[PDB]
Write a protein that binds this ligand. Sequence first.
Ligand SMILES: Nc1ncnc2c1ncn2[C@@H]1O[C@H](COP(=O)(O)OP(=O)(O)CP(=O)(O)OP(=O)(O)O)[C@@H](O)[C@H]1O
Ligand SMILES: [Mg+2]
Ligand SMILES: [Mg+2]
Length: 410
Amino acid sequence: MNYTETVAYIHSFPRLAKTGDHRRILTLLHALGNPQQQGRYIHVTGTNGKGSAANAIAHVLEASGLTVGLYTSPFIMRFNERIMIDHEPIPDAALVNAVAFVRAALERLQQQQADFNVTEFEFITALAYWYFRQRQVDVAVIEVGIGGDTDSTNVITPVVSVLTEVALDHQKLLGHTITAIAKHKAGIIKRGIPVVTGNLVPDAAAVVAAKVATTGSQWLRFDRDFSVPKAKLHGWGQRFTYEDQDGRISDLEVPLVGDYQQRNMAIAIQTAKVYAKQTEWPLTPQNIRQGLAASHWPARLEKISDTPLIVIDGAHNPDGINGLITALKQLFSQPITVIAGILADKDYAAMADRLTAAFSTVYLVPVPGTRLKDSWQEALAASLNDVPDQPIVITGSLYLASAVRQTLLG
Ligand SMILES: Nc1ncnc2c1ncn2[C@@H]1O[C@H](COP(=O)(O)OP(=O)(O)CP(=O)(O)OP(=O)(O)O)[C@@H](O)[C@H]1O
Ligand SMILES: [Mg+2]
Ligand SMILES: [Mg+2]
């Protein structure tokens, strides 16, 4: 198979039941020589901020001289972005050869167990684990797909775990209460392994304190052990100060806007320091400053057009919507239009009340492959014609942001 066929092959996998015992992926992995049991890992979970945190942790450790695998989702411009090494997406040719190796092993399994199969995410995760070992990365930063305990990625023992935050999202999968969702996320916390977390709402904090008690894990929490005591906009980015039990690193800069990113970044920094410590590896404030400076992350409050002014974002659950509003409020001191593809979660109605309550013009649209408009293209055309003086912010799952970015830029 060539590259195009290979990708199409990856997207052809079935949606199987959700056991949560990882037997399917463990079967494929075993046939791949158990790459998940070799090397080192950093496991990242959380309702919002997983990718931004994972991306920065990788940049900081890369700056310190380590070869780092990064596994994130969803891709924004193209598939290859899901598996990166030192931030270079897996080469087309390399993906073709990788897909062929895994397919061959899969085939051998099916010839021994006639009805055996894996899901698309299971295939990709196994391929990623195998790829990271083939290239012998020093460490792989792994973003959990959904939840924590039952995710296909949860077949590893990391050096450090990360739980950015817990907010309501993915209920028909994780739970209907913060406590329930929290218990699922805490599942990536392992015996004796440190866990770095954001500032968690009380209910979630209790679940985590309870878990660390059982695992005996060292627990570093934003606003307790490490923090961001100062920050300010600096272009389409932020300049801030990080502080933890070792002191302060001043004048740090990240090319990201949104107050919540100060949290994601602080989590990344604390996490990388813990990694370096647990592995007896050198990590300087210079390494950290360099990595943060390189921490570009598409579709995260990204201005992709100046005239007209267009920003895209992936906020689509109430917490993200709340973070989005607060941010937009600090970024614009003029009327703006917001096009939201939140027509998906029940969550929808309340989020829309919050948007229309805070902004001048709000359009609601579906997500590609799912006030009212039939598509984001229609809402944009509407905005540019009825409110030409209003910048446009397009938000919803990253799938909508991605479709918009691909369309307007690639
Ligand atoms: N600490 C934080 N507090 C509040 N909001 C935050 C946040 N960190 C990130 N966000 C919001 O989430 C969006 C995506 O950020 P990230 O890529 O870091 O998220 P995740 O990796 O958790 C997304 P997904 O669940 O993979 O995707 P998908 O759900 O799109 O399928 C941002 O554009 C922003 O709206
Ligand atoms: Mg999500
Ligand atoms: Mg993500």
